[PDB]
DNA sequence: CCCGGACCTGTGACAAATTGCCCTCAGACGG
DNA sequence: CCGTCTGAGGGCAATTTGTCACAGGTCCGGG
């Protein structure tokens, strides 16, 4: 009943490492850009706080640190690499931020597409669970269900999981179980899965889901 | 044969990072 | 001018995320 995010599958499937707060800002950029090619977006502290139920102070802290942490971050489309920002962010007015997204990213944002309402993701905390929920939406049916098999090496490459999750028991305990639990507790989706094996190695995860 | 070895699992510890909270004080504005 | 609503700073303890040692399973093959 809330803003409807839509994005090219190329972003859903891109390789990058962003925090929760950065991904939150990124949804509004994609929304602003889409409602129109200069790459200039803006974020208001007082509106961000209302959208995500934060105080003005903690809103200010999240934006500021998110913004300075974009520096040096890059995005790869499988491959081709780009910087997100081509100028530091800056504040012309108190409570207002202005940002310069790489105009070469515009066609990767708007294209074979993914869509969800912002209320679906705004309570998720772990950013890897946000990645997972975006990739499942890419396969959702009008009625709200789907089934998809994701390869483990591709999950590790695209979501840029940290090195110790290449050991399968650590992958299970700290990524897979936590993110399925968040989705089931924080979104209107109800998710289950099963592991596919080849010899002793586990190679894919097969996800099934329906809507509440 | 049958050991050492190369694989695989899960769990207990600890280290590093993130969470929502709390308090201070100056900016912008309007009555 | 000043009182109030903001937000830009400085911090906190409680949880979560990231890493690795060690117990305990299987199957393989040469000396
Ligand atoms: Mg992280
Ligand atoms: Mg925060
Ligand atoms: Mg023995
Ligand atoms: Mg093996
Ligand atoms: Mg025992
Ligand atoms: Mg043994």
Short mmCIF file of N, CA and C (backbone and C1' of nucleotides) and ligand atoms in Angstrom, two decimals, chain A residues 20-21 24 54 58-59 61-62 65, chain B residues 18-21, ligand 2:
data_model
loop_
_atom_site.label_atom_id
_atom_site.label_comp_id
_atom_site.label_asym_id
_atom_site.label_seq_id
_atom_site.Cartn_x
_atom_site.Cartn_y
_atom_site.Cartn_z
N UNK A 20 22.97 -3.13 5.68
CA UNK A 20 21.52 -2.97 5.73
C UNK A 20 21.12 -1.53 5.40
N UNK A 21 21.71 -0.57 6.11
CA UNK A 21 21.38 0.84 5.93
C UNK A 21 21.64 1.30 4.49
N UNK A 24 18.93 0.02 2.22
CA UNK A 24 17.72 0.80 2.45
C UNK A 24 17.74 2.09 1.65
N UNK A 54 12.45 5.30 12.74
CA UNK A 54 13.60 5.73 13.51
C UNK A 54 13.37 7.13 14.09
N UNK A 58 18.88 9.01 15.23
CA UNK A 58 19.43 7.75 14.73
C UNK A 58 19.32 7.67 13.21
N UNK A 59 18.27 8.27 12.63
CA UNK A 59 18.22 8.46 11.19
C UNK A 59 19.47 9.19 10.69
N UNK A 61 22.37 9.53 12.09
CA UNK A 61 23.55 8.65 12.19
C UNK A 61 23.58 7.60 11.09
N UNK A 62 22.44 6.98 10.76
CA UNK A 62 22.49 5.91 9.76
C UNK A 62 22.86 6.45 8.39
N UNK A 65 26.70 7.63 8.13
CA UNK A 65 27.73 6.60 8.07
C UNK A 65 27.56 5.74 6.82
P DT B 18 29.65 -3.81 10.82
"O5'" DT B 18 28.21 -3.72 11.52
"C5'" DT B 18 27.33 -4.82 11.49
"C4'" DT B 18 26.23 -4.67 12.54
"C3'" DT B 18 25.52 -3.30 12.57
"O3'" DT B 18 24.13 -3.47 12.13
"C1'" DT B 18 25.94 -4.21 14.78
P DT B 19 23.09 -2.26 12.09
"O5'" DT B 19 22.10 -2.53 13.31
"C5'" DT B 19 21.63 -3.82 13.61
"C4'" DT B 19 21.05 -3.84 15.01
"C3'" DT B 19 20.27 -2.59 15.40
"O3'" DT B 19 18.87 -2.71 15.09
"C1'" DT B 19 21.79 -3.25 17.16
P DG B 20 17.97 -1.40 14.84
"O5'" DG B 20 17.55 -0.91 16.30
"C5'" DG B 20 16.61 -1.68 17.05
"C4'" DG B 20 16.66 -1.27 18.51
"C3'" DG B 20 16.01 0.05 18.85
"O3'" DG B 20 15.41 -0.03 20.18
"C1'" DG B 20 18.32 0.14 19.35
P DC B 21 14.43 1.12 20.74
"O5'" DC B 21 15.18 1.65 22.06
"C5'" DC B 21 16.59 1.81 22.01
"C4'" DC B 21 17.22 2.15 23.35
"C3'" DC B 21 16.89 3.55 23.89
"O3'" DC B 21 16.77 3.56 25.32
"C1'" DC B 21 19.21 3.42 23.31
MG1 LIG D 2 21.75 2.56 13.65
#
